[PDB]
A paper describes a structure:
Bromo and extra-terminal (BET) proteins provide a recruitment platform initiated by the recognition of acetylated lysines (Kac) by their tandem bromodomains (BRD, Dhalluin et al., 1999, Jacobson et al., 2000, Owen et al., 2000). BETs, like all of the 42 human BRD-containing proteins, contain additional interaction domains that recruit other proteins to the acetylated protein target, forming complex assemblies and contributing to processes such as chromatin remodeling and transcription. Direct targeting of BET-BRDs by small-molecule inhibitors such as the high-affinity and pan-BET specificity thienodiazepine (+)-JQ1 (hereafter referred to as JQ1) enables their displacement from Kac. Multiple decreased interactors harbor sequences that can directly associate with BET-BRDs in canonical or new BRD-mediated structural binding modes, and we propose that the tandem BRDs present in each BET protein may be capable of simultaneously recruiting both a histone and a second interactor.
However, when crystallizing a Kac-XX-Kac SIRT7 peptide (K272ac/K275ac) with BRD4/BD1, we surprisingly found only the first Kac within the binding cavity. Strikingly, a bulky tyrosine residue located 5 residues downstream of the first lysine (Y277) instead inserted into the BRD cavity, stabilizing K272ac via a hydrogen bond. This, together with our finding that several histone peptides with longer linkers readily bind BRD4 BRDs (Kac-X3–4-Kac), suggested that associations could be mediated via more diverse protein sequences and structural templates than initially suspected. We show that Kac-XX-Kac sites on non-histone proteins insert both Kac in the BRD cavity as in the previously characterized histone H4 peptide (Filippakopoulos et al., 2012, Morinière et al., 2009), while longer linkers can insert bulky residues in place of the second Kac (e.g., SIRT7 Kac-X4-Y motif).
Residue numbers in the entry:
A (entry chain D): 270 to 279
B (entry chain A): 42 to 168
C (entry chain B): 43 to 167
The structure:
Amino acid sequence: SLKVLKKYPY
Amino acid sequence: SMNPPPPETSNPNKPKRQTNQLQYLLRVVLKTLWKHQFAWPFQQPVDAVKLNLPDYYKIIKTPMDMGTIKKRLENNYYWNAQECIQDFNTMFTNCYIYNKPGDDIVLMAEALEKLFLQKINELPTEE
Amino acid sequence: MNPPPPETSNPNKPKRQTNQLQYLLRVVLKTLWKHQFAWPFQQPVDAVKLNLPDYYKIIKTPMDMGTIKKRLENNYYWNAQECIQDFNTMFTNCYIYNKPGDDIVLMAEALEKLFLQKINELPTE
């Protein structure tokens, strides 16, 4: 599993 | 790279009407998708600055998101239900274009599109 | 499942406030919080929401700025060095879990550069 900034909630 | 201006949500030169289909698209379809667990990336224009996506607006020439669609519906921007349906479809297809099959964000968009299609299957006939 | 967030209050410590701990809250935490790349570090990693089922298999000492903020507010630390260690843990976790050169890592690196500037200006006790 990889962090993808595009789907990172803010 | 700057973000582009968001898509227009109001144009006082366009004639306006309310229809039962447009009301259903706001009160049922948008509402239901908005509350979906995977809706968050689709609730506003893609912020390519914050998310460091220098190529997003090189690739996606017709951006669309549910925040825009919501504003368009609340503004009576749409004359035809089909304009709204097209905007949803543009949102989903943009996600598929920019990203790759089996990316988590694509699976999120697919879940919202499946729900979308289920709700559009119950779109009432124009009264 | 996520773990519970890190402890932030320990009633079995007495209160000591210092100019170094006050600086860590009013300057270091404040400035880092407001940085444009702080947002992924402001709360514990929500491995469930983010679909990272191995995050807490790999990271056994999680740390985030929301926790540090609370610890400083609750006078959880006796000294500045305990607080500094928490910031450093936060950066190292990001470096351990994520691939070098990924966006999140570059964000952490920028925050760490700012942190090290602010710690260079730490007042004397």
